[PDB]
Design a binder for these strands. Structure first.
Length: 91
DNA sequence: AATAAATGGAAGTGGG
DNA sequence: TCCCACTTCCATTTA
């Protein structure tokens, strides 16, 4: 049962959806979603999870928000931009 | 207004 | 029982 932050890190490693997500500064772990193409990536997350409903970027971003306190992923002050923790990057 | 994004509480679902 | 790790729904706010 893959975790959302790992799904995203795995995508950034593989390059399979390079038009939906990309590194901004990979050394810092900052990454950004495509305004126009993020929904396709959200859809893939829902299908990988086997969720009942179609996944949307908004719901996926709601899940990302919950990582802010524990630290795996923090929202950066640029649109659609986030940052993985050093711990997540190391694994 | 139209569109997009952000904020985030609250309740529901999984699989322990 | 009761937390995990989200998912789903909704109202609101900002640009």
């Amino acid at each position: 049962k893959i975790r959302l932050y790992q799904f995203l890190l795995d995508l950034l490693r593989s390059g399979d959806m390079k038009d939906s997500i990309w590194w901004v500064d990979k050394d810092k772990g900052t990454f950004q979603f495509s305004s126009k193409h993020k929904e396709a990536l959200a859809h893939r997350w829902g299908i990988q999870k086997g969720n009942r409903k179609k996944m949307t970027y908004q719901k996926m971003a709601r899940a990302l928000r919950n990582y802010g306190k524990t630290g795996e992923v923090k929202k950066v002050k640029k649109k659609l931009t986030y940052q993985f923790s050093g711990e997540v990057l190391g694994r």
